[PDB]
Design a protein around this nucleic acid. Structure first.
Ligand SMILES: Nc1ncnc2c1ncn2[C@@H]1O[C@H](COP(=O)(O)OP(=O)(O)O)[C@@H](O)[C@H]1O
Ligand SMILES: Nc1ncnc2c1ncn2[C@@H]1O[C@H](COP(=O)(O)OP(=O)(O)O)[C@@H](O)[C@H]1O
Ligand SMILES: [Mg+2]
Ligand SMILES: [Mg+2]
Ligand SMILES: [Zn+2]
Ligand SMILES: [Zn+2]
Ligand SMILES: [Zn+2]
Ligand SMILES: [Zn+2]
Ligand SMILES: [Zn+2]
Ligand SMILES: [Zn+2]
Lengths: 590, 396, 186, 590
RNA sequence: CCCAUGUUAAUAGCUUCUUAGGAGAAUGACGUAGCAUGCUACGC
RNA sequence: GCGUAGCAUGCUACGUCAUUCUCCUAAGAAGCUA
């Protein structure tokens, strides 16, 4: 087929078959891409290989057109000619092709490995059509890296609520959470097919897993769970729409007598109503999801699609929407696979509803009035382009916080990524400044929020709350078990249980730690509700049990530290094992 | 598998002598593709054999009509020519004879197809052709039966049906004769063996099938183009009742087609030096050509003038753009020159003078639009009668 | 051909030949220069006809590549059109009654001819004259396929709406028959 | 691409290349046109340029035809023959062509720049196909003169309805009114894109250019404005459809007991029935635009299209039809763009009603049974050609007076155009006399008729009124300020403001001034409805406040003055500038 | 020193004609190599 | 007499250019027949 070259936007029919994505390149650009890197195979409407019954020379420089086909230098017909010549590669639209000298940057994108953080920062400063390409090939590379994971199958049939794993020998083990699912396959004699998705969590002790089946046809031992890497569709729409300020608000008809609670941001509601897309930088727990609720109320005769990256963000937003917005004109869309049970108090899958809450991956093709995308630091440019492709609306509002943890970003191991390169929106917030800023927190007490203000902001955090004398940071050396792919501090849980007897406050508490293995084992010896820092960042609670396992760069992340300390409202039993990580906060020594 | 298929009914826009609308069943490409692959080898070996009964693919030009008419008269004893006419051939034709036609066109697959493969191809023909869903102006109706005129095998399935009705007429005419009155002791024994092979055997008797087919070719020679048949039957036999006359076809079409074939559409030509009275809408006359006598086909003059005067597109009215249209019409109307009625023989010279006038005014206008006549111009031969008479001489 | 060195060799051999004609060398040398000019012209002929054949073939391959690209683009467009047609005809089903009759079959197969007759919501009756109209759908409700239908519209052959007060024995001449009465399942 | 020669209607294929309209030309006529003037470029089915690889010879006297292309003198193949030879440029249909002698007029029409006085008198006494060609090339010249205006650029945005503009250096400023629409741009790096169709008006205080816009975009500093130019549609229909005196009335059925008001007009109605097109000429306010409604009420089965070149003329017709005609079977047509507001009481944009009303440029292609073209003095041969191309009808009635003010003819600066050159119909009324004539002032008081029947119409008017004692005309010099080109006179607005507190009944009067800008600027001091003299032609008012702004050739034009003062139904105040004209009328002194 | 305007067309057969590509042949012509013989310049 | 060189003429091979023919295919316009 024919299309448009990525780095010059000229009509072509050539595409480097050595890239994982096969991007369209014109004559000159493809010539420059094959002459430079190790990319050699080129696909036209037919592939550029030696099309003799016996040969395999799959480069383009060595290849000669003869008759109606292509041959190597050993089998070529006496009549000419090489494709890769005249400064070009023989393809379509040769006279009207106009190249560009970006092929060094394009080669650097196509040659990278996503191990350095230099690849990620180069994959964010390029032009828009290369930003899409980098996001697409990065998603593909991470999906290939996920695919090569060791299989599991049940030992034998045990129970409805507790099975037991058996892995392939000596392979990497997937992180066990609600993000990761398996599929059971049925190759029994007889037609390998999916028996259903399985969601796995760690159980009480040993090699035990609490399991959730999607299709409940109970399995035997021959049906096996695999990580099932799934297809990634291409993307077309830009990461952001082009901005266009308006003199006055178009089509958004404001109402009167809104409320006195969120009347303090009607100026920022209007400033949203003016421009095309808006950027709200909310400090941790400053009414950011509250802002979008008040926005939906200020222009209530409009249509809003709330969109979130992770399920937890739209879960918190659905709770707040039930609280303030009228439930009757509001639908929460759940994907049909039903892998994770969403917050269902709205009508499920009413896409024509006035206000629709959804994850970014399962968005229906709709036109809206203003679409509010939520928690942008979780999202990568793939997500922003997906929401721009599926959802067309008169206004776009991106709310989030650079001071949170980014996308999980598994491929990156050497170097650490600044928030500036998390995605395009977080680049733009850090570049010109955010459109809107919220300024008075309502979760932390004053001392802890002042610790936040001195840490990552320019002394701009304050909170309308006073301390409960229940902000702890224990002194334990933190013996790490490490009998697992992650790190576990079960003696830190021993420290927690040998304390907290004289402090009975945090007994409905949520357990927080940067290591999900400690979260997994924590819910077993004691009946504690636990959720890691990944399942944090959207979940606000009053009583908190935090543990810091090691003293290293994993626990030294300042954004993860900020989002960890900003979680607790009235009572925090926290263990900080690092002296420096106890030195920068004013907490009780005991 | 069985693929049922919707077939449109298109209204035809062409010149005709009677004012009933004519419709053609446009069959889906999902049916035409597969039926082409199934039947194309046989259907392109029928059109490439000269001298057989089924004269499809034998041209009437270059002395082809003479050769068709000479292979009809393949030594029948006292010939009379006979021609019949199925009324509503494509609508009254029962489902059983269409299934027989598709089972005779599929006997060539003894090796390439299995048995269940041939059954599912029969079911696909009966679901896409015979009793399909006809779409007639934005509405799906059920077509009850009978051939649809647009599938991949329609002139040939029609030819098989036509041969079947002629053989059934001969079987009825031979059995229905008395039997003590049959003087020729060979033919009376043939009637006896024929009844026995019909109603007293369950296995096909290839000796007698060959012998009866030899009888039919010796005394009932046929020539078939999809339903136009010319028969050259022995006349002493058909007078004695041992071979089908017209009245046997009237009876057969009564009980096996549910139509009454009125004898004002079936001709009988007792004098062979006038040829068939009408076959494929061309009459036939015996002219002197070169040094010997040949048969030539001539059309109906009203047809050729009606194709001149009434055209089905506005741009065909212009004339000067369409000189190939009048060359083709004069090629078709050439043998009218040898017809003895003078007002018939003027149709050819009308077309020649019209081609000459058309070309004179064409070069007039193409000399006005420029100021140079065409340098090379070989239209000077389309108004000489030798270019047309070369189309009916047997050299090529 | 012109950018080939063969043209340069032929041109300089021709220049040497003109210079020797103007120079009047010995006849053996003139024959030698004619020989060299002839072999230069033969090499020029070989290479120039070679490049002409080559560029004809390359333009042919470009034209067939264009044809393949057009065929594959049109295949993509037809596949899109067929898929959207199938999905609109999916959305047009009447899934309650259709599920009822399909789940009432003992094998799961029902003949196609009774899919509309028991699940269609609109009945279009086409009526050629007035006696037929009086017998099949007189009044604003009637019966067909063991249901009761309510007449929602009557148009004529001209797609003009005809009121039910029009269709009488004396106003039957002035109506453009046939009449298409559209009814709904009650 | 064959066509018809303009000046002999032979068949041909050439087109002159230097003429703006590319008129088709026969061979002999094209030789006459390219051998006398400097128009040396000719286009056949392909141009007559030299088809060398690189050569610029276009002069048809130089080229040769060889092979299948036209080569200059230094690239001709030896099989060639000259084009511009034997007195005939070679084109198609070469030898079936008739020469002409009008190539001493067609040259002057196609060559001149339309600025002198004589070119319009030559564009109006030629043959009919030359009248159409001359009108077409005049329209094209007036369109391409608009490219000579300056280019705007924003300096700052004082307010959302108050821009600030700086114009290009050395190029004249366009006049700022709603005739001239501009297009915006933001062309920096970054979006060389139109950002809306705007139009301007000079705000009263400061150098503020109050802009109206189609869009709702915020305007930056760098946004810059380019005037739009409309392509001239080619025209085909004759200016005057040929007359055919019938024997008896066809297509029209007269009426029983029409009215007591139009009873004296019956003879002219029979005359309109008998002819094909008829022309009516009367001095102002004497029943001309009334006669058209009487034609409506005398042939009630006759579908009528009323047309004029302004919008206030057709609005005066609309008001008269509202008073007399049934309002259900009437209409009115407004264009979609519509920078000006029109009359809105009929069912707007319903051309199927029996009595349609339109401006001549915005007519829809339809038929009629009698079509009434009011105000032919404001019509050019382009307008009459358009009304003859769209409207097909049985009778035409052209109503108007030559002594009112014409189409403006912006290019005309050197000379004066007598009435008999305004278009073809005004020539017909000043050559052979009008078919129907009614002079008796039924609108203006006898003082107005007494002073206006001495200026233009030499003592031929008597009024069906008397001296109504409300005709005041004063002489105040009025020290002027200058706008772009349309001067503004503050102290005369001052004396009018004095004549508004001291005469209470006159607060319904309409302001009339010869300049558009003062007409806009005296609304913000006074508040009266405002109308310019050029667009006031045909609609009357109860009281009229006229203010002569400047002593020039434009505002001291006696036709402009006549159409200014003959619109007052009962009372008028005239603040004069010229001494002699103030002595020419005979009002009260004031 | 300036004023009015944007309206549905089937399956199959045969035949005529035109254009383009390729192959082959036939003739002619040029050029190169190889051979047949003759002639001439040199050596033996 | 032989060898070498050149020249003539005739044949064979190859490279090209024109003319003609045949055919195969592709594409288009048209006519008739069932
Ligand atoms: N301007 C405000 N005035 C009063 N309360 C506020 C304001 N903004 C936010 N809140 C409080 O903060 C709570 C929302 O907290 P949470 O659910 O964590 O959302 P967010 O993370 O957006 O703050 C609400 O219950 C609300 O009472
Ligand atoms: N027959 C008549 N008798 C009395 N008054 C008339 C007659 N005809 C017209 N009028 C008055 O004279 C005025 C002329 O208006 P109009 O026809 O618009 O004049 P013009 O066409 O010159 O603008 C109208 O206001 C009308 O009231
Ligand atoms: Mg929030
Ligand atoms: Mg008037
Ligand atoms: Zn590549
Ligand atoms: Zn490119
Ligand atoms: Zn090879
Ligand atoms: Zn010119
Ligand atoms: Zn002329
Ligand atoms: Zn040149």
């Amino acid at each position: 087929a024919v299309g448009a070259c990525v780095l010059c936007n000229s009509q072509t029919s050539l595409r480097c078959g050595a890239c994982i994505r096969r991007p369209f390149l014109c004559c000159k650009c493809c010539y420059d891409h094959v002459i430079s890197t190790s990319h050699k195979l080129v696909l036209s409407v037919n592939p550029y290989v030696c099309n003799a019954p016996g040969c395999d020379v799959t480069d383009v420089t060595q290849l000669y057109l003869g008759g109606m086909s292509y041959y190597c230098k050993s089998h070529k017909p006496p009549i000419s000619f090489p494709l890769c010549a005249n400064g070009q590669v023989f393809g379509l639209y040769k006279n009207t092709c106009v190249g560009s000298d970006n092929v060094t940057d394009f080669n650097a994108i196509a040659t990278c490995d996503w191990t350095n953080a230099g690849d990620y920062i180069l994959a964010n400063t390029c032009t828009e059509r290369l930003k899409l390409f980098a996001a697409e090939t990065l998603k593909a590379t991470e999906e290939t890296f996920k695919l090569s994971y060791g299989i599991a199958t049940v030992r034998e049939v045990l129970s409805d609520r507790e099975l037991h794993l058996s892995w392939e020998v000596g392979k990497p083990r997937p992180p066990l959470n609600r993000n990761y699912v398996f599929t059971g396959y049925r190759v029994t004699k007889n037609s390998k097919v999916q028996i259903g998705e399985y969601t796995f969590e760690k159980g009480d002790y040993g090699d035990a897993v609490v399991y959730r089946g999607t299709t409940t046809y109970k399995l035997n031992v021959g049906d096996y769970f695999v990580l099932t890497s799934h297809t990634v569709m291409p993307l077309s729409a830009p990461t952001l729409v082009p901005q266009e300020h308006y003199v006055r608000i178009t089509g958004l008809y404001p109402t009167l007598n809104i409320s006195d609670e969120f009347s303090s941001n009607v100026a920022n509601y209007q400033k949203v109503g003016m421009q095309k897309y808006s950027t709200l930088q909310g400090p941790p727990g400053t009414g950011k999801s509250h802002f979008a609720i008040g926005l939906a109320l200020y222009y209530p005769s409009a249509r809003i699609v709330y969109t979130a990256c992770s399920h937890a963000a739209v879960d918190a937003l659905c709770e707040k929407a039930l609280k303030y917005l009228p439930i009757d004109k509001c639908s929460r869309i759940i994907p049909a696979r039903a892998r994770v049970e969403c917050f269902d108090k709205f009508k499920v899958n009413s896409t024509l509803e006035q206000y629709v809450f959804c994850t970014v991956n399962a968005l229906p093709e709709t036109t809206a009035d203003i679409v509010v995308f939520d928690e942008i630091s979780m999202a990568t440019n793939y997500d922003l382009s997906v929401v721009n492709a599926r959802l067309r609306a008169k206004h776009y509002v991106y709310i989030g916080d650079p001071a949170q943890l980014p996308a999980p970003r598994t491929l990156l191991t050497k170097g650490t990524l600044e928030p500036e390169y998390f995605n395009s929106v977080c680049r733009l917030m850090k570049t010109i400044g955010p459109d809107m800023f919220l300024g008075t927190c309502r979760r932390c007490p004053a001392e802890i929020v002042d610790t936040v203000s001195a840490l990552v902001y320019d002394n701009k955090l304050k909170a309308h709350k006073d301390k409960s004398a229940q902000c702890f940071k224990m002194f334990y050396k933190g013996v790490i078990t490490h009998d697992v792919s992650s790190a576990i501090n079960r003696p830190q849980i021993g420290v927690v249980r040998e304390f907290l007897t004289r402090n009975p406050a945090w007994r409905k508490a949520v357990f927080i730690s940067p290591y999900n293995s400690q979260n997994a084992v924590a819910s077993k010896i004691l009946g504690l509700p636990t959720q890691t820092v990944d399942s944090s960042q959207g979940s606000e609670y009053d009583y908190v049990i935090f543990t810091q396992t090691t003293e290293t760069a994993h626990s030294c992340n300042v954004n993860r530290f900020n989002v960890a300390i900003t979680r607790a409202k009235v009572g925090i039993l926290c263990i900080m094992s690092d002296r420096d990580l106890y030195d920068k906060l004013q907490f009780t020594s005991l | 598998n069985v693929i049922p298929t919707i077939t449109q009914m298109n209204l035809k826009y062409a010149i005709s002598a009677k004012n009933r609308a004519r419709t053609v069943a446009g069959v889906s490409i999902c049916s035409t593709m597969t039926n082409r692959q199934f039947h194309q080898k046989l259907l392109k070996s029928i059109a490439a054999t000269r001298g057989a009964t089924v004269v499809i693919g034998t041209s009437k030009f270059y002395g082809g009509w003479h050769n068709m008419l000479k292979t009809v008269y393949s030594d029948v004893e006292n010939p009379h020519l006979m021609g019949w006419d199925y009324p509503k051939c494509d609508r009254a034709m029962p489902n059983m004879l269409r299934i027989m036609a598709s089972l005779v066109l599929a006997r060539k697959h003894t090796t390439c197809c299995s048995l269940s493969h041939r059954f599912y191809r029969l079911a696909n023909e009966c679901a896409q052709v015979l009793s399909e869903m006809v779409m007639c102006g934005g509405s799906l109706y059920v077509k009850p039966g009978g051939t649809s005129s647009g599938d991949a095998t329609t002139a040939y399935a029609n030819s098989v049906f036509n041969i079947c009705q002629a053989v059934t007429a001969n079987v009825n005419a031979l059995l229905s004769t008395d039997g003590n009155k049959i003087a020729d002791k060979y033919v009376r024994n043939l009637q006896h063996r024929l009844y026995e092979c019909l109603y007293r055997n369950r296995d096909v008797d290839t000796d007698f099938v060959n012998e009866f087919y030899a009888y039919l070719r010796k005394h009932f020679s046929m020539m078939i183009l999809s339903d136009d048949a010319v028969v050259c039957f022995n006349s002493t036999y058909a007078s004695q009742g041992l071979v089908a006359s017209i009245k046997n076809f009237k009876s057969v079409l009564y009980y096996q087609n549910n139509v009454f074939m009125s004898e004002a559409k079936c001709w009988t030509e007792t004098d062979l030096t006038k040829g068939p009275h009408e076959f494929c809408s061309q009459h036939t006359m015996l002219v002197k050509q070169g040094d010997d006598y040949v048969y030539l086909p001539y059309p109906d003059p009203s047809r050729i003038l009606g194709a001149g005067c009434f055209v089905d597109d506005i741009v065909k009215t212009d004339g000067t753009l369409m000189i190939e249209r009048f060359v083709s019409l004069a090629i078709d109307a050439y043998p009218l020159t040898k017809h003895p009625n003078q007002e018939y023989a003027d149709v050819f010279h009308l077309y020649l003078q019209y081609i000459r006038k058309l070309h004179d005014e064409l070069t007039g206008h193409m000399l006005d639009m420029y100021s140079v006549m065409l340098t090379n111009d070989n239209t000077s031969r389309y108004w000489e009668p030798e270019f047309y008479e070369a189309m009916y001489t047997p050299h090529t | 051909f012109s950018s080939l060195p063969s043209y340069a060799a032929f041109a300089t051999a021709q220049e040497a030949y003109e210079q020797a004609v103007a120079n009047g060398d010995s006849e053996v040398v003139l024959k030698k220069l004619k020989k060299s000019l002839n072999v230069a012209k033969s090499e020029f002929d070989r290479d120039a006809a070679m490049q002409r054949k080559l560029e004809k073939m390359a333009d042919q391959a470009m034209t067939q590549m264009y044809k393949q690209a057009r065929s594959e683009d049109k295949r993509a467009k037809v596949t899109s059109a067929m898929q959207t047609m199938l999905f609109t005809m999916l959305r047009k089903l009447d899934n309650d009654a259709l599920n009822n009759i399909i789940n009432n079959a003992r094998d799961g197969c029902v003949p196609l001819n009774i899919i509309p007759l028991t699940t269609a919501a609109k009945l279009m009756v086409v009526i050629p004259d007035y006696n037929t109209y009086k017998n099949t759908c007189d009044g604003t409700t009637f019966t067909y396929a063991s249901a009761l239908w309510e007449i929602q519209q009557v148009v004529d052959a001209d797609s003009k709406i005809v009121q039910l007060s029009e269709i009488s024995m004396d106003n039957s001449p002035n109506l453009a028959w046939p009449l298409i009465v559209t009814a709904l399942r009650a």
